[PDB]
Amino acid sequence: KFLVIAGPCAIESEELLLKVGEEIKRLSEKFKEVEFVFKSSFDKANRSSIHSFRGHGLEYGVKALRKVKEEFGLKITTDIHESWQAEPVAEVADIIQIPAFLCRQTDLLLAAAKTGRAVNVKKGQFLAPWDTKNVVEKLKFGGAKEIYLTERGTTFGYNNLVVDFRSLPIMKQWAKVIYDATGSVQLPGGMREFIFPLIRAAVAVGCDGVFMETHPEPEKALSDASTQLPLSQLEGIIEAILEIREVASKYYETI
Amino acid sequence: EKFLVIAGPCAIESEELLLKVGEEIKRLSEKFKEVEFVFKSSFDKANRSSIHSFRGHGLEYGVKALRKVKEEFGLKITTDIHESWQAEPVAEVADIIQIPAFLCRQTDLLLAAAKTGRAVNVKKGQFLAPWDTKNVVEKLKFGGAKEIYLTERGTTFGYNNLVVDFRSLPIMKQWAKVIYDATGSVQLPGGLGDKSGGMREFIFPLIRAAVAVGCDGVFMETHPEPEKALSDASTQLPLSQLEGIIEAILEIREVASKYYETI
Amino acid sequence: KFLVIAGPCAIESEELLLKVGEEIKRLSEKFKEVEFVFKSSFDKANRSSIHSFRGHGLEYGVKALRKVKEEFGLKITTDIHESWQAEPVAEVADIIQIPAFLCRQTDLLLAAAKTGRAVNVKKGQFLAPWDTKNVVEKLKFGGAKEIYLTERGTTFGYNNLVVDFRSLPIMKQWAKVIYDATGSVQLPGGMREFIFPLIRAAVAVGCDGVFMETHPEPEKALSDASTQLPLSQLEGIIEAILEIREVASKYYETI
Amino acid sequence: EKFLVIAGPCAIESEELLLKVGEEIKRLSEKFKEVEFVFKSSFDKANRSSIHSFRGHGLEYGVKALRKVKEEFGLKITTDIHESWQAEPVAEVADIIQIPAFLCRQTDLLLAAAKTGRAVNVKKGQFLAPWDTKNVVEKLKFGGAKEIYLTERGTTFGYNNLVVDFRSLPIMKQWAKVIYDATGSVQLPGGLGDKSGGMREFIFPLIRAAVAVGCDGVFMETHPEPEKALSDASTQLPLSQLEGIIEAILEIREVASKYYETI
Numbered sequence A, C: 001k002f003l004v005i006a007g008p009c010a011i012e013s014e015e016l017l018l019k020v021g022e023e024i025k026r027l028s029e030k031f032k033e034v035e036f037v038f039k040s041s042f043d044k045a046n047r048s049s050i051h052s053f054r055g056h057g058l059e060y061g062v063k064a065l066r067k068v069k070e071e072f073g074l075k076i077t078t079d080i081h082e083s084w085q086a087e088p089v090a091e092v093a094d095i096i097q098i099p100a101f102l103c104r105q106t107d108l109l110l111a112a113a114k115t116g117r118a119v120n121v122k123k124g125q126f127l128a129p130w131d132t133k134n135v136v137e138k139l140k141f142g143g144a145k146e147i148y149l150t151e152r153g154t155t156f157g158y159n160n161l162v163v164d165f166r167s168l169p170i171m172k173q174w175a176k177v178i179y180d181a182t183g184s185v186q187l188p189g190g191m192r193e194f195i196f197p198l199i200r201a202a203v204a205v206g207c208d209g210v211f212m213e214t215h216p217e218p219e220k221a222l223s224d225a226s227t228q229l230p231l232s233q234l235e236g237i238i239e240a241i242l243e244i245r246e247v248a249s250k251y252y253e254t255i
Numbered sequence B, D: 001e002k003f004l005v006i007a008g009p010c011a012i013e014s015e016e017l018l019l020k021v022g023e024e025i026k027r028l029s030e031k032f033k034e035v036e037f038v039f040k041s042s043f044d045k046a047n048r049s050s051i052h053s054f055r056g057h058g059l060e061y062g063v064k065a066l067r068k069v070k071e072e073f074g075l076k077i078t079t080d081i082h083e084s085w086q087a088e089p090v091a092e093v094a095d096i097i098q099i100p101a102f103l104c105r106q107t108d109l110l111l112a113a114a115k116t117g118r119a120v121n122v123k124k125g126q127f128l129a130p131w132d133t134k135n136v137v138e139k140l141k142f143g144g145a146k147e148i149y150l151t152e153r154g155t156t157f158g159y160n161n162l163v164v165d166f167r168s169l170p171i172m173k174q175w176a177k178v179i180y181d182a183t184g185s186v187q188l189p190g191g192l193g194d195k196s197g198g199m200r201e202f203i204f205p206l207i208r209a210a211v212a213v214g215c216d217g218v219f220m221e222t223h224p225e226p227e228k229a230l231s232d233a234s235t236q237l238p239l240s241q242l243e244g245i246i247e248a249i250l251e252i253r254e255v256a257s258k259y260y261e262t263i
């Protein structure tokens, strides 16, 4: 079924995770046609500044995510940054996320695949759509069976990302495709006003799921404060994309 | 508001070609009554890459051919101008005067079109940022234009490639009605060396994106047999597929419409 | 010999043209190895704003340029915007300049070629280096014998131009190549600090000439105030590029 | 200041290959005494496009091979790390620890390299703007790095193509010494499908541009027979051409030097 990956960018506390998980659970019960996956990072390992918020560590993060899966029965996904993190994260993560800058790091991909979990690779801002075929091949070689590729924009001049929707049908040739609605509008080194319009475009074109970072109060977020979707707006957007998908799906081109 | 569909063969290869396409557009206009159709065709391809490529049969012949389409089918007409002096004669038949993408900053051309009293549709230059179309609209208003359109047709992305930044739709909507050029946006400028290339397989997906985001109309160059077209053979939509595409975008527009943001 | 095309962006008055022409003449006498061509536009036909300075008209402009050639014996170059302007401009213009946005307008190119004058086409920000071969062919078909292609940057994201120096050797295959040092640093819709560094790069790579818009007081210029080179700095830059060219020329690759 | 020339085969194909290249670099270091040479080679290509491409013979073998080069020729050494744990063992032989372009924002990797006390050279990510390297240098200084380099190696320009924006040289010079990667800047990422492409014909012209603009050193991957290289076969410079290139850039640097702007 259609996938909706959502949650706060970073694990600011398992308190926040529980408050967001509660809403994700409610939507999960309301939209039985959709498969929800809770997401949050235990570490922002690639912040621009050395003085920015990274997180509370792997152990604290896995614990918090563990509480979300136990308390709400929701699937989990988080990203890893170095090979050794794949094993401990796989304990709770149903889907292991590979950061965009690291989409070409062979050992990280292999380490994720070895865990037997599903793998979701964020497409690097430097990669062409067709370049992702090799990424999928590495994962298959590593034993991965459930593979996703996430569109999150491509480098367009400096401090700007553009979404080339031609990427969706191209990547669908070798993997399930996810559209990152919040990451695609960020200005590297973003505009929330474009999150909804572009996600509508994503489902009109055709994808297997959407990815959205959401926070009760984005402006207070410790990471991605300018792009995280306010929690209260999630339901409306999901209902909207489901309706558009229902009508547009008749026209999705065959593989 | 009535959705606009601008369509027709890229170039006026012959008056016969125009009437054939015009007949189909007229038929669709009778079926899709909620759509405002405007027949398009260029009397001159003044910016071909190669000196050896087809340009046209002249302004005189073209206008005459376009007038025949309007007379026979009662369809609104649009064609593009390339130099200031062409605005007057063209305004005699054209309901909408089109400004080529490379010429979107040529003040005199914009002014020439604006003083005719006809509607003006400016193709957004591949070098222009969305927010910089505000001054383009200002020039037209200054020149007397009362009905203005801005057409998204892609932006230079590396060499011989164009990308469509859909954020341009809501940005440009701030100052003019917005049209999405479904066939021009998938062309590969100079992709074939002496001619430009294109990827027809992406025409439909991107037009679905356009209506989901929200626009005031779509622009599509269509030809009975694109493979044999004298210009844009790689991007013109087979005429037989026009009906299906229009039905689809009207369906997607309807379902997405309640979510279009207010400007 | 090496070409240096320089002058104020727009003809704000024949007074300005004479003051700049006087300096250009002095340098012309100092650098006999270089061929100087005086440049200025009689009309800025593509300003972003309808309220910006365009000029004093074709007639007034040609007259002013005519005075420069008569009073200083300098060659002249100015740009045309519509086909009908080629004939009257050719009366004084030794080199007819084709604006970047208009580099694909067949009739403008043909009209320029018909005059029998040399033609210098500014490479559109949307053109790939190899795409210029067809531009040259149009001019040759139109009777042009002296053809130049000028590098002035390529669209790089929004409101930014990047100079891909690979363009110089590529375009040299079919035409003489000129580097526009002032236009290449402008930010469409620039930084003067990069004019000199990039022009040094241009001659190190290898070109047939440089193009620079210069004004006694750029900040007071009616057009391109942010990129025009202060007149007093022209001599130093020319001497500098001549020295670099002298040494680097030993390494310029054969056609 | 002494000009830096970082050169060597892309990957450590064998200890034999390293000694062959090392011998030539040593010879050039004896001729060009005004240049500081640093021998480069990767013990692992951890980011190949294809799972079937050559990666290397492991960290242990690589370090041993690099130490042999340093021992036999007395040359400074540089190699890249891919994960934090590699900084310590690599610092035992490497005078300069190299940070891969895709990893230029990985905080822990930068920190790992900085605490070794060795010099650190960061390849500028193809996604990074020049002004955003300021924070990269800040992270390294925070981590204890006292000798920092930033290497220009091109920026994403459309698909499978890189462009060198030379404005980056004077911008980055504001916070670190700047190196120009002459061979990486002409590669066509994923250009050959399973492998990346490249245009060797542009290596020399662009390196001439780099020294005319002004930089603190150049980086060049070189191999006796590039055509047979196991990695970057399309961009590595034939070893026989290294001497000529170095002589040329030293000549251009000298004549342009009086014009380098003060930061």
Ligand SMILES: O=P(O)(O)OC[C@@H](O)[C@@H](O)[C@H](O)CO
Pocket (backbone or CB within 6 Å): B045, B047, B048, B049, B050, B053, B100, B101, B184, B187, B189, B190, B194, B195, B196, B231, B232
């Ligand atoms: O085929 P060439 O001559 O390159 O012309 C490209 C066409 O696609 C042309 O009509 C284009 O969209 C012009 O603006």
Ligand SMILES: O=P(O)(O)OC[C@@H](O)[C@@H](O)[C@H](O)CO
Pocket (backbone or CB within 6 Å): D045, D047, D048, D049, D050, D053, D100, D101, D184, D187, D189, D190, D194, D195, D196, D231, D232
């Ligand atoms: O040939 P592939 O595997 O694409 O790798 C590209 C090389 O050019 C590679 O070593 C590159 O510069 C990696 O960063």
